[PDB]
Amino acid sequence: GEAPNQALLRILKETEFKKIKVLGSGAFGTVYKGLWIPEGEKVKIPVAIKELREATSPKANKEILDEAYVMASVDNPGNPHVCRLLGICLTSTVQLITQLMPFGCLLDYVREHKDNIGSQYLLNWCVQIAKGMNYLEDRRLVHRDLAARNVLVKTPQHVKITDFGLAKLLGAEEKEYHAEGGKVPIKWMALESILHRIYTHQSDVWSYGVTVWELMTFGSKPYDGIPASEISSILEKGERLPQPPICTIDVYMIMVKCWMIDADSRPKFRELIIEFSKMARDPQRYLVIQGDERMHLPSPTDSNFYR
Numbered sequence: 021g022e023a024p025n026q027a028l029l030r031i032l033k034e035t036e037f038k039k040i041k042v043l044g045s046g047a048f049g050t051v052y053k054g055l056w057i058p059e060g061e062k063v064k065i066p067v068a069i070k071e072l073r074e075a076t077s078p079k080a081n082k083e084i085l086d087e088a089y090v091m092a093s094v095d096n097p098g099n100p101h102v103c104r105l106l107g108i109c110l111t112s113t114v115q116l117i118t119q120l121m122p123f124g125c126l127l128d129y130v131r132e133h134k135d136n137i138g139s140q141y142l143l144n145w146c147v148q149i150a151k152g153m154n155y156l157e158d159r160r161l162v163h164r165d166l167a168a169r170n171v172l173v174k175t176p177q178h179v180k181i182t183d184f185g186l187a188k189l190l191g192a193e194e195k196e197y198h199a200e201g202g203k204v205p206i207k208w209m210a211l212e213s214i215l216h217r218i219y220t221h222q223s224d225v226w227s228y229g230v231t232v233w234e235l236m237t238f239g240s241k242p243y244d245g246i247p248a249s250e251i252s253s254i255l256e257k258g259e260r261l262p263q264p265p266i267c268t269i270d271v272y273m274i275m276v277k278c279w280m281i282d283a284d285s286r287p288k289f290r291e292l293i294i295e296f297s298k299m300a301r302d303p304q305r306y307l308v309i310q311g312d313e314r315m316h317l318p319s320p321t322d323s324n325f326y327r
């Protein structure tokens with residue numbers, strides 16, 4: 021049958037890392053920033069730690085361990101654009117240890133660095149995610165949570181994907197997955213995903229569309245001031261996210277194409293890579309950003325030391 025995934029997980033001790041501050045927070049997530057002191061060795065490395073409330077419920081300890089597995093599984097050959105699980109520690113709570121990305125979740129970076137953002141970078145990233153998401157498709161896994169918050173920034177030239185926790189790995193055949201889930205990110209989901217609770221690879225392509233919309237709108241909220249319950253009902257009326265002000269009509273078409281009701285009529289990921297790569301060569305043509313020429317952002321990775 022299929023090949024064995026020989027990749028391992030470094031199960032490592034608590035005494036060695038010291039958590040500094042909380043980077044991201046949610047009812048589902050409480051992820052820290054914390055330096056790690058690796059036992060005996062004379063090295064110190066920064067890292068991010070993710071934890072949930074102490075294990076009153078085992079089902080809780082199972083769900084977190086599931087995420088550790090899948091995140092673990094991808095080192096595989098490995099990818100430049102996909103985040104790698106570093107380690108794990110065991111405590112009444114169960115801790116995930118992920119190599120920290122300095123600039124944080126990409127969504128925030130766009131909201132604060134709206135100025136000096138390039139017409140180039142935005143196009144470049146979409147290629148970056150489209151590259152990353154295809155690798156997931158190749159692995160027969162659906163991330164199932166793609167969103168702006170879930171893309172990390174190693175450098176302004178490099179971005180990565182993360183937070184698999186919802187995501188579910190796929191066996192051969194096994195084209196689609198249906199699950200009874202308590203909490204999901206409704207706004208970033210496909211119509212069939214909301215109605216039938218069915219998740220596909222093309223379900224992910226939808227979320228991609230909303231994600232790029234978030235990027236092109238500079239970190240605006242999808243559907244500014246609209247309740248979560250109503251959303252399932254309005255989309256079948258045909259309404260989608262409005263055109264972002266800065267998008268040339270070519271780009272918007274690609275965003276709209278990701279929101280087709282027919283799951284097959286949406287673009288596949290290889291298609292998205294090629295389209296955006298083609299745009300990338302001449303960004304000015306495909307993105308009108310005021311004063312785009314001369315934008316500030318820093319090529320060599322010069323100092324970001326200040327906290």
Ligand SMILES: *CCC(=O)Nc1ccc2ncnc(Nc3cccc(Br)c3)c2c1
Nearest residue numbers: 043044068069070116118120121124125
């Ligand atoms: C929007 C908040 C946020 O995600 N901040 C942030 C900054 C830097 C990171 N570096 C590495 N990983 C993560 N997120 C993450 C997700 C799941 C599990 C773990 Br241990 C870490 C961040 C997140």
